[PDB]
Design a protein around this ligand. Structure first.
Ligand code: HEM
Ligand code: HEM
Ligand code: HEM
Ligand code: HEM
Lengths: 141, 145, 141, 145
């Protein structure tokens, strides 16, 4: 579970992301797609070229979901209810892929926030993304 | 593994960057972010807090050696297997390190490179480094197979 | 995380285990040590040979913790509080090792409860052991 | 792979495995226990309930193929890599199955051997089969390396 200290770290880091959330979401997707080509097969309907409108639009949605999570750190399972059903039931996303996007998000945040991305903050964000990932992979039928 | 283009990119980047504190940061971050990894480093002293870990002189010194090994790997990209065969047996059979951790460290290293190196560490260049660290991790896990 | 159906399956299966829990925990440890010899290194001053009283004694303790967990599915974090500090903070058990013990437990249960170990029950027990494993690994910090 | 004597133990035991049922049970359990794997079998018809998965003739038929593939590897234990060639390119370069799932299916097969053979499937024997399935998983994943 996220500690109160972890929640503090997550909220402050996301505050630092500030107006760049959608931009970082898009960059994280791009880094996922280039580093881990297997993840591309989830988006056969996308133009995945650098700067594509679909990746940009999708980066913004992923970012908005992370924003929602950050505002709801005391109850992630409730906050991400619809998204969990979608990823686990409809899209059948392999749980390994959440680790790939999470790493891609940490790389992005590290790159843009190098003074804010201390080891403690890195550890809190990693737990946050893992917990989001746990929630989004927690639901079957 | 890497295209000639990817090898040229990785090699030019590694040539220019100042990395003498990178390895210590990467090892420090591993032990902070994945604290079970501390089990393997009892002889290093105070690892009781994030700050203690990061400023531990033994962590910093070991990390540099670990990066030295990675750089050696970078100079023999055609033969990561032969290059890490001896280290593979050491880590797997003597130190009892689960091979998942080789992947975790490679990925921490990538995060560290991104933190230290700004816009030049592009999605394309980072993906090349992912191939490198995946190769190092596979070579180290070999004595498992 | 366990659904109502999962909790039902886990309670029914553990009922079938009954008084054999200690025996099955000892067998599962044995299978773990033999199949995955690096797990032995967490027990340096145990004799881990077949029939060792230390393996039998420890098997009984692991099974007791599992029985406690089956009785407290709505609150695994609280029920396994002491054990999570022991494994995650004191002993710093690598998270991989819980997957290895969980598999060994599934093997042992499948062996001894073949008529009870249906695909649905297998899936429920898998989720239970993953959730026990999550709790036991939650206090590295 | 295994010692000459381990090979002998595994060979003798494998003789008893019913070439039909076991594969279908393993594949069916993979799909039930790890539902994301269903993503790869969209053309197999109804996979919506555990009963539907287990009784699906396409799952049963395909399970037979995978088991026959395992049976084939059992005859080539010192060269699993070459033996799982066209399969590794299929599973990796065409289907893009994450290799973690090769490990999971290997482990399901072991659980299935246990359920079907009970006390005969001893800790020592099972340990032998763990080496085998890890060998098969590693061979299948080679096209990613
Ligand atoms: C931090 C983890 C993740 C978050 C917060 C997240 C969030 C989202 C959101 C907000 C949407 C739009 C849903 C809607 O229309 O209501 C979406 C869709 C989708 N996601 Fe994720 N996602 C995550 C992980 C992943 C991963 C790891 C993959 C696969 C590699 C994936 C694949 C997809 C796909 C294929 C869609 C449908 C996209 C489309 O057709 O436009 N997601 N996700
Ligand atoms: C990128 C992957 C890795 C590389 C290239 C690497 C390389 C090395 C090298 C070169 C040494 C010997 C350094 C010396 O000369 O003193 C070493 C030692 C060691 N490594 Fe690694 N290693 C890696 C990953 C890991 C991981 C993930 C762990 C554990 C979580 C680990 C645990 C150890 C331990 C316990 C030692 C002995 C330290 C001592 O002397 O007390 N290694 N490694
Ligand atoms: C289902 C998951 C597990 C459960 C329910 C469990 C349960 C227990 C219990 C009840 C104890 C005794 C606590 C005490 O002494 O007060 C214990 C101790 C211990 N456990 Fe676990 N455990 C699990 C997983 C693991 C794994 C995967 C490992 C390592 C591979 C491990 C290694 C140990 C060790 C080294 C001890 C101390 C034994 C000694 O030296 O006295 N545990 N565990
Ligand atoms: C780990 C051991 C595995 C073995 C021995 C194995 C074996 C096989 C074999 C023998 C075939 C038929 C190929 C041909 O005739 O050319 C096949 C096809 C296939 N396998 Fe596997 N497989 C394994 C793992 C997996 C896993 C883990 C998955 C999915 C999560 C998977 C998904 C598939 C799919 C989707 C096909 C094509 C089915 C179709 O549409 O006809 N395999 N496999």
């Amino acid at each position: 579970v996220l500690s109160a200290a972890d929640k503090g770290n997550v909220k402050a880091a996301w505050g630092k992301v500030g107006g760049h959330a959608a931009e970082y979401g898009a960059e994280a997707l791009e880094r996922m797609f280039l580093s881990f080509p297997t993840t591309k097969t989830y988006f056969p309907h996308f133009d995945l070229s650098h700067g594509s409108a679909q990746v940009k639009g999708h980066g913004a949605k992923v970012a908005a979901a992370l924003t929602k999570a950050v505002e709801h750190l005391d109850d992630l399972p409730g906050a991400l209810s619809e998204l969990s059903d979608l990823h686990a039931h409809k899209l059948r996303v392999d749980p390994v892929n959440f680790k790939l996007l999470s790493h891609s998000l940490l790389v992005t945040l590290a790159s843009h926030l190098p003074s804010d991305f201390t080891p403690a903050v890195h550890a809190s964000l990693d737990k946050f993304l893992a917990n989001v990932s746990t929630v989004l992979t927690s639901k079957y039928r | 593994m890497l295209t000639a283009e990817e090898k040229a990119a990785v090699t030019a980047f590694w040539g220019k960057v100042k990395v003498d504190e990178v390895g210590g940061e990467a090892l420090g971050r591993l032990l902070v972010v994945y604290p079970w990894t501390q089990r393997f480093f009892e002889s290093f002293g105070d690892l009781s807090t994030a700050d203690a870990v990061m400023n531990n002189p033994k962590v910093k010194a070991h990390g540099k050696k670990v990066l030295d090994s990675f750089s050696n790997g970078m100079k023999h990209l055609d033969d990561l297997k032969g290059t890490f065969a001896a280290l593979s047996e050491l880590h797997c059979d003597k130190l009892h390190v689960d091979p998942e951790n080789f992947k975790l460290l490679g990925n921490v290293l990538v995060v560290v490179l991104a933190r230290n190196f700004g816009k030049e560490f592009t999605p394309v260049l980072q993906a090349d480094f992912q191939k490198v660290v995946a190769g190092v991790a596979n070579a180290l896990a070999h004595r498992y197979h």
